[PDB]
Amino acid sequence: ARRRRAEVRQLQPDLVYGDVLVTAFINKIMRDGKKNLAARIFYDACKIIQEKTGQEPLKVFKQAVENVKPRMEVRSRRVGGANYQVPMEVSPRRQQSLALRWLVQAANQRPERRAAVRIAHELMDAAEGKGGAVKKKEDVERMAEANRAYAHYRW
Amino acid sequence: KAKVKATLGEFDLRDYRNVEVLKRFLSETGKILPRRRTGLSAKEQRILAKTIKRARILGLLPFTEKLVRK
Amino acid sequence: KRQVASGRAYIHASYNNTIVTITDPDGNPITWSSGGVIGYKGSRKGTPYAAQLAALDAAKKAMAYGMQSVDVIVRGTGAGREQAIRALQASGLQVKSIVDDTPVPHNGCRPKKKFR
RNA sequence: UGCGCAGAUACCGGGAGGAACGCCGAUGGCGAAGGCAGCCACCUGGUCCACCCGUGACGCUGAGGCGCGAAAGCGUGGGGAGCAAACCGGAUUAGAUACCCGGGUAGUCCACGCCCUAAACGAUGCGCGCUAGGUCUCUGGGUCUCCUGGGGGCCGAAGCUAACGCGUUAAGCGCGCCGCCUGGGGAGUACGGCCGCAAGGCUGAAACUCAAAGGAAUUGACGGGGGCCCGCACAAGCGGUGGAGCAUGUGGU
Ligand SMILES: [Mg+2]
Ligand SMILES: [Mg+2]
Ligand SMILES: [Mg+2]
Ligand SMILES: [Mg+2]
Ligand SMILES: [Mg+2]
Ligand SMILES: [Mg+2]
Ligand SMILES: [Mg+2]
Ligand SMILES: [Mg+2]
Ligand SMILES: [Mg+2]
Ligand SMILES: [Mg+2]
Ligand SMILES: [Mg+2]
Ligand SMILES: [Mg+2]
Ligand SMILES: [Mg+2]
Ligand SMILES: [Mg+2]
Ligand SMILES: [Mg+2]
Ligand SMILES: [Mg+2]
Ligand SMILES: [Mg+2]
Ligand SMILES: [Mg+2]
Ligand SMILES: [Mg+2]
Ligand SMILES: [Mg+2]
Ligand SMILES: [Mg+2]
Ligand SMILES: [Mg+2]
Ligand SMILES: [Mg+2]
Ligand SMILES: [Mg+2]
Ligand SMILES: [Mg+2]
Ligand SMILES: [Mg+2]
Ligand SMILES: [Mg+2]
Ligand SMILES: [Mg+2]
Ligand SMILES: [Mg+2]
Ligand SMILES: [Mg+2]
Ligand SMILES: [Mg+2]
Ligand SMILES: [Mg+2]
Ligand SMILES: [Mg+2]
Ligand SMILES: [Mg+2]
Ligand SMILES: [Mg+2]
Ligand SMILES: [Mg+2]
Ligand SMILES: [Mg+2]
Ligand SMILES: [Mg+2]
Ligand SMILES: [Mg+2]
Ligand SMILES: [Mg+2]
Ligand SMILES: [Mg+2]
Ligand SMILES: [Mg+2]
Ligand SMILES: [Mg+2]
Ligand SMILES: [Mg+2]
Ligand SMILES: [Mg+2]
Ligand SMILES: [Mg+2]
Ligand SMILES: [Mg+2]
Ligand SMILES: [Mg+2]
Ligand SMILES: [Mg+2]
Ligand SMILES: [Mg+2]
């Protein structure tokens, strides 16, 4: 976007939870344009997390997303020859996409056979502070505070 | 900001021994204020400089000072 | 083993490193730190974060001798010259006064080709 | 590389030594040019203003001569902190006989004697007379919004100029005198001479060779020049190719 701000798309509220954060997550699961497949995966995974754990799948979904949100990341900036890893804050919009993507990516590295089984379990672990999505978040937050010597390059 | 000659009396620019007035022309450091800040004429600045430098040798005016700030 | 409880802290800031010395009121040093005293080795020493830690490393060492009041003396231009000071103010050591004493010649010595 | 446990760097005190003068400092001042910045005293040159006193054309320029002449370099003797040709190393690199980093001799400073070059530039020789102004400034005098000298800048009348530009600080208009130029390369070379301790300087060709060498300005183009702004150009993101097997096209054979 060289000209405009590139306004953000406004997703449709969820059909079940009326929540936009759910619909965006269902999209991240969808592949090859099969949204009916993605929603059935996400919604069946709500049954797994609501039975094997006696809490609201709505609240755990949000609680899992909040724990994967990184507060800081690193970016590369060309300075006097080779560039540097420069730590800087994450836009709240960027914390949205990053956590969701990591949650879906981490759940597919899981052992579980069926998709919804991986999603529910990943969300359960992510909500508890463990799980593969939180590791990526913690490892990124490790990149910051490590190259923190370059905090003068903020840009 | 006011200029040094503006808030001052009728003083001898050639008297190297009057420190109370000559101190007024030095900065927070021992440097001599430029003509913008002294309001003095071209000839008056030439005279002030040598008389200030004179007093610096008698120990009456400092060569350089230390800035208490930043 | 001294208990001076007050003294002076000198900040020497160059573009290649920043180092801090902490002395008693008559000027004799107590403890000191630098960008090399903390882990940093190369051009990282000239970074302000190094100046921040070096200041805090020296501050904590002065705590062991009981330092509370600190008069700050600054010498040199360089990155983290200020960042070294702002680390001293929040180190717990009360900063009594800050003075810039950087030695400037009256054009007495011919500089290296670098500086001409 | 180097320096540091034989205790550096950083910090306080004391001492030694050499070189250069921060601020003031200026787009400023002074000199014939080179050039001249701490302060004090002595010796001393130039220059400018007022008075309208004195001399009474005593003036201008100037081949030769003579004196001066940044830096570097030379001789003798000193001096030597910092910088630093050469050089010793460390890196970089395709290579590094360099740019960058650590060292370091001459030298840079002083005295006395040489050397005589320079983009020694205003690339504009000196003196005098004449030709609109406006503005900034250094320095004198004045009845001191200002007038009047003598310098240093910028715009600009007329005019000049190939053009840029110059324009009472002429590159204008005139006059006097000195120096100097006659296409480029060869060549500031060869020879001879004069000078020099040397390095070299002053003077300064020919054969041969070429149809050019040059100046200013124009439109473009380019910049590892500047500003401003676009495109899935980058970035953010999603799926790919490069691997496998096959289909097809090309290279090669
Ligand atoms: Mg590059
Ligand atoms: Mg360094
Ligand atoms: Mg060693
Ligand atoms: Mg050793
Ligand atoms: Mg000392
Ligand atoms: Mg010595
Ligand atoms: Mg100056
Ligand atoms: Mg002159
Ligand atoms: Mg000159
Ligand atoms: Mg005199
Ligand atoms: Mg005189
Ligand atoms: Mg008369
Ligand atoms: Mg007569
Ligand atoms: Mg004459
Ligand atoms: Mg002659
Ligand atoms: Mg001579
Ligand atoms: Mg000479
Ligand atoms: Mg010389
Ligand atoms: Mg010599
Ligand atoms: Mg050196
Ligand atoms: Mg060197
Ligand atoms: Mg080498
Ligand atoms: Mg090598
Ligand atoms: Mg190369
Ligand atoms: Mg000559
Ligand atoms: Mg002529
Ligand atoms: Mg007057
Ligand atoms: Mg004039
Ligand atoms: Mg003009
Ligand atoms: Mg005309
Ligand atoms: Mg004339
Ligand atoms: Mg002409
Ligand atoms: Mg000639
Ligand atoms: Mg010819
Ligand atoms: Mg010729
Ligand atoms: Mg020659
Ligand atoms: Mg001959
Ligand atoms: Mg000869
Ligand atoms: Mg001879
Ligand atoms: Mg020689
Ligand atoms: Mg020669
Ligand atoms: Mg030419
Ligand atoms: Mg041309
Ligand atoms: Mg045009
Ligand atoms: Mg262009
Ligand atoms: Mg290139
Ligand atoms: Mg570059
Ligand atoms: Mg693209
Ligand atoms: Mg991309
Ligand atoms: Mg293939």
Domain boundaries, chain C: 1-116
Phi-psi region of C3 (alpha: psi -120 to 50; beta: other; left: phi over 0): left
- Closest residue (CA) to C1' of nucleotide D22 is C106
Q: CB contact, 8 Å: A149 with chain C?
A: yes
Total residues belonging to chain B: 70
CA distance A47 to A61: 12
CA distance C58 to C37: 10
Question: Which residue of B31, B53, B68 to mutate against C (max C Cβ within 10 Å)?
Answer: B68
Strand-pairing partners, residue C99, are C73
Q: CB contact, 8 Å: A148 with chain C?
A: yes
Distance of CA A122 to the CA centre of its chain: 12
Look at residues A118, A100, A103, A136 and name the one whose alpha carbon lies nearest to residue A48: A118
Minimal Cα–Cα distance from B67 to chain C, Å?
A: 5
CB distance B68–C98 less than 8 Å? yes
Resolution for the entry shown, Å: 3.5
Q: Which of A149, A151, A152 sits opposite C44 (nearest CB)?
A: A149
Tokens at A150, concatenated: 């370059």
**Inter-residue contact A36 to A30 (CB < 8 Å):** no
Q: Are strands C29-34 and C18-23 parallel, antiparallel or unpaired?
A: antiparallel
Look at residues A127, A120, A128, A112 and name the one whose alpha carbon lies nearest to residue A45: A120
DSSP string, chain A: --SS--PPP-PPPPSSS--HHHHHHHHHH--TT-HHHHHHHHHHHHHHHHHSS-S-HHHHHHHHHHHH--SEEEEEE--SSS-EEEEEE--HHHHHHHHHHHHHHHHHTSS-SSHHHHHHHHHHHHHTT-SHHHHHHHHHHHHTTTSGGGGGG--
In the block, residue with structure tokens 């672990």: A125
Strand-pairing partners, residue A86, are A75
Amino acid at site A132: G
Question: Measured between alpha carbons, how far is residue C114 from residues A125, C18, C38, C46, C104 in Å?
Answer: 60, 20, 29, 18, 17
* All structural domains of chain A: 1-155 (1.10.455.10)
CATH number of C1-116, picked from 3.20.20.10, 3.20.20.140, 3.30.360.10, 3.30.420.80: 3.30.420.80
CA distance A49 to C93: 53
